[PDB]
């Protein structure tokens, strides 16, 4: 039976979201690609380049018009007429608009596509802009994080394929399943927070006992993600578990909320 077409494009990005996706432990990214979706366009992985890649793009968005999921990694820059990000000699934004027009739904992978991420931090030299400020007539599912959790990315895909539906979202377009609660609402160091048991300097006695990282700048109290429950890399760890406070990396504007080490 045919697999659901997916077109995966890249704007200004670091490719962390693609890298996260291929970490997926269950389903393996191999099995996602071979059996769950048809990953029909993806600059990072596809054989074809140049004119052959353009032909793929055009053929897929035409033949599957109205029927493909568009995944977006990165974002369009509005500065310099868009030519801070060039694809096939033209502004990336033109490719984004063409792809968006034919999509049934759009997944904004990562804080880049969702909000802006590091290139949109002050003073935003390129006028990097999140997808939903450019594409205003299509469903956009925001999957933020820098990058999002690998098994969250693949669970979202499996949900869409298995249940033949978009995930229900909060008021910001994030899937409720993984972004309904805060890091700090499911953090295993909460006992320490509640008792006023804090790391005060790196590698102090508190740190060696896994005390709370709030006084070291942890932004888990204002960050919605699944890191303290699902965790990272097949459940091996997450930022706090390995001794660094949450940076807030799933939240809009987290780069410009002050030092990561301050309150």
């Amino acid at each position: 039976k045919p697999r659901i077409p997916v077109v995966w494009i890249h704007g200004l990005e670091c490719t962390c979201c693609t890298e996260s996706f291929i970490r997926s432990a269950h389903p393996l990214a191999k099995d996602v690609i071979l059996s769950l979706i048809s990953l029909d366009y993806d600059d990072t992985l596809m054989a074809a380049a140049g004119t052959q890649a353009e032909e793929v793009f055009e053929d897929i968005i035409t033949q599957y018009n109205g029927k493909y999921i568009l995944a977006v990694e990165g974002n369009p820059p509005l500065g310099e007429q868009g030519m801070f990000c060039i694809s096939s000699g033209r502004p990336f934004i033109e490719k984004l608009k063409r792809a968006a027009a034919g999509a049934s739904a759009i997944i904004a992978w990562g804080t880049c596509a969702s909000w802006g991420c590091v290139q949109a931090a002050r003073p935003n030299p390129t006028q990097a802009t999140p997808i939903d400020k450019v594409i205003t007539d299509k469903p956009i599912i925001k999957v933020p994080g820098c990058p999002p959790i690998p098994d969250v990315m693949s669970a979202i895909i499996t949900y869409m394929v298995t249940f033949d539906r978009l995930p229900d979202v909060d008021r910001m377009g994030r899937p409720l399943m993984f972004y309904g609660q805060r890091i700090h609402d499911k953090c295993y160091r909460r006992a320490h927070f509640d008792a006023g048991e804090f790391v005060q300097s790196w590698d102090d006695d508190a740190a060696r006992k896994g005390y709370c990282l709030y006084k070291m700048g942890c932004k888990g109290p204002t960050t919605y993600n699944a890191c303290s429950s699902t965790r990272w890399n097949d459940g091996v760890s997450f930022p706090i578990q390995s001794g660094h406070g949450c940076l807030g990396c799933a939240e809009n504007g987290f780069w410009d909320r002050g030092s990561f080490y301050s309150r």
């Binding site: 970490r23 990953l39 992985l45 596809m46 590091v118 390129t126 006992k209 997450f238 990561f260």
Partner: protein, 581 residues
């Protein structure tokens, strides 16, 4: 049209122009243009970075302690290496020395990245340039088993396995949804593997795609997550507790056991899957030992990496040697000094930036990142480029030089430097490898050689992972647990004005971050990154960078199909987000 001579090449932009935009199976955005003569030989090559974000501008005014987190996001492929260079640079500026275990753990983080990145590059990025995936459908499963077993002890080699892999590919393509294989170059005459070697390589593609996810569990233990683990100025935040109450909240014996398990599996996969596959590509593609030499027989550069003596970045400490060769004189490995203003300089006469004088280069402590999108007299227009004008500004990538010389960086460069400095392990590895291929040492200076050296380096890094792990455990056995120095954590303890350099060898080559701190804040933060070197545009002398040189003089079987261009570019493992930052 024009013609001029540089570095032994005749740069001639007469004749047919070919454009490859987008370059795929790389990180980020690149455009390549060439001219070819009537003999289908490239006579001109143009390397263009087609993205820019401006991290060096974004870092101004930030707290130096936060810098690592920002610059880590230069790149999610080489994830972590920019954080390491950042903490190095800030520690160098302020005068901070980290505890031994922090240094060992950082060395583990870097070796982990080398293993992971090199593995994924070999299979997922470059592999399909060498392996004809659709030709695997024609292989005989038993002959595939016999081939694999003749090359390796690796267990997964049964005829039944190869049949199952083949049937999976058969099913994949049976509905006409070829996905990443659609409209590929399959059947091109430059595909030289027999069907059985294609099936073996494709099975390994799949095994590598699965296995790579495991490697980065080491990053998750020490750094919280991959991609983009966490770090600190002063060491690492992964406090250790082996034998005291609350070890459940720290790096403890169970966490270290997990690390050891991953190291052993990583070594095994690299040694018994990646290595034999690299040699097999060599055996079937020997002509590519004479294609794509570029600058690799003239000028190569390594800063060196993996300081084994904590906080000592000298030659006696770095386990991966540094040095520079110019003018093809491999008898003279020259020392590199990243503070010397006459050594590393970047030019922008052919890039989209403003300088007060674009005819000179600027050392990074005098660096300027003032973006200026000015493609000038293109064929087409500024928002619809049909042909870049390489006589003027044609890239978001700055042009680094070393004492005015255009250099190649990366695994081949490092291999040459270490070989010619007399590193015993490197000499033995290279000699054994080239002996097995019946090729001269010069055969490494090539597109094929870049792939061979990358595989070598993955095996090297896997062995170093065990070495570093053992050193960490030795310290813990001796009661040496410290992972952070915090006596200069607070800004009031810093010099009012200071500057520092953080350097290392990323997967793709020499990386440096130059930072100036004033009044507690980043005053300047300039990055020169390995793909900035290799993908460099030209300089005021017209000197070409490593990609443009390696593409020069290349034969193309079919002009409309850029297989040979992709092979050579992919052999350098381009990271365009890195290159431009």
């Amino acid at each position: 049209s024009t013609q001029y001579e540089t570095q032994g090449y005749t740069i001639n932009n007469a004749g047919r122009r070919l454009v490859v935009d987008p370059i795929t199976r790389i990180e980020g955005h690149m455009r390549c243009e060439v001219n070819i003569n009537d003999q289908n030989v490239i006579t001109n090559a143009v390397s263009c970075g087609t993205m820019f974000r401006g991290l060096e501008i974004i870092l101004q005014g930030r707290d130096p302690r936060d810098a690592w987190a920002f610059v880590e996001r230069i790149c999610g492929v080489c994830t972590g290496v920019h954080a390491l260079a950042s903490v190095y640079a800030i520690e160098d500026a302020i005068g901070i020395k980290v505890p031994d275990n922090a240094n060992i753990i950082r060395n583990i983080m870097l070796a982990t990245l080398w293993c992971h990145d090199h593995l994924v590059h070999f299979y997922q990025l470059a592999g399909m340039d060498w392996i004809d995936v659709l030709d695997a459908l024609k292989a005989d499963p038993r002959k595939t088993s016999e081939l694999a077993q003749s090359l390796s002890s690796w267990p997964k080699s049964s005829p039944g396995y190869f049949f199952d892999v083949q049937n999976r590919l058969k099913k994949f393509v049976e509905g006409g949804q070829l996905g990443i294989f659609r409209n590929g170059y399959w059947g091109h005459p430059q595909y030289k593997l027999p069907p059985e070697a294609n099936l073996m390589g494709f099975a390994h593609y799949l095994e590598a795609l699965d296995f790579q996810r495991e490697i980065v569990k080491i990053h998750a233990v020490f750094g919280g997550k991959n991609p983009h683990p966490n770090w600190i100025v002063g060491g690492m935040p992964c406090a250790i507790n082996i034998d005291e109450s609350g070890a459940v909240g720290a790096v403890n014996m169970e966490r270290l056991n997990l690390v050891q398990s991953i190291i052993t599996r990583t070594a095994d996969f690299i040694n018994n899957v990646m290595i034999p596959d690299a040699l097999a590509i060599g055996q079937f593609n020997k002509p590519w030992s004479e294609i794509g030499t570029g600058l690799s027989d003239k000028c190569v550069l390594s800063y060196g990496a993996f300081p084994d003596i904590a906080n000592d970045f000298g030659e006696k400490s770095l386990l991966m040697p540094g040095g520079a060769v110019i003018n093809g004189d491999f008898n003279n490995v020259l020392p590199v000094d990243l503070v010397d203003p006459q050594q590393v300089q970047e030019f922008v006469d052919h890039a989209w930036y403003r300088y007060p004088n674009d005819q000179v280069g600027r050392h990074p402590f005098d660096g300027i990142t003032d973006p200026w999108y000015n493609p000038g007299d293109v064929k087409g227009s500024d928002t619809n480029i049909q042909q870049l004008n390489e006589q003027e500004r044609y890239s978001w990538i700055k042009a680094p030089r070393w004492r005015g010389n255009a250099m190649e960086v990366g695994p081949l460069a490092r291999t040459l430097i270490a070989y010619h400095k007399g590193d015993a392990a490197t000499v033995e590895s290279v000699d054994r490898m080239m002996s097995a291929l019946n090729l001269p040492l010069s055969g490494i200076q090539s597109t094929l050689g870049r792939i061979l050296c990358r595989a070598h380096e993955a095996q090297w890094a896997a062995g170093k992972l065990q070495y570093f792990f053992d050193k960490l455990m030795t310290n813990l056995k001796n009661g040496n647990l410290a992972t952070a120095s915090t006596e200069k954590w607070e800004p009031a303890t810093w010099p009012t004005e200071c500057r520092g350099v953080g350097f290392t060898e990323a997967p793709r080559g020499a990386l440096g971050h130059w930072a100036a701190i004033r009044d507690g804040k980043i005053d300047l933060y300039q990055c020169v990154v390995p793909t900035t070197w290799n993908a460099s545009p030209r300089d005021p002398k017209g000197q070409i960078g490593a990609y443009e040189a390696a593409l020069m003089n290349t034969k193309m079987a079919i002009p409309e199909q850029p297989l040979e261009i992709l092979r050579t570019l992919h052999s350098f493992d381009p990271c365009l987000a890195c290159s431009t930052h």
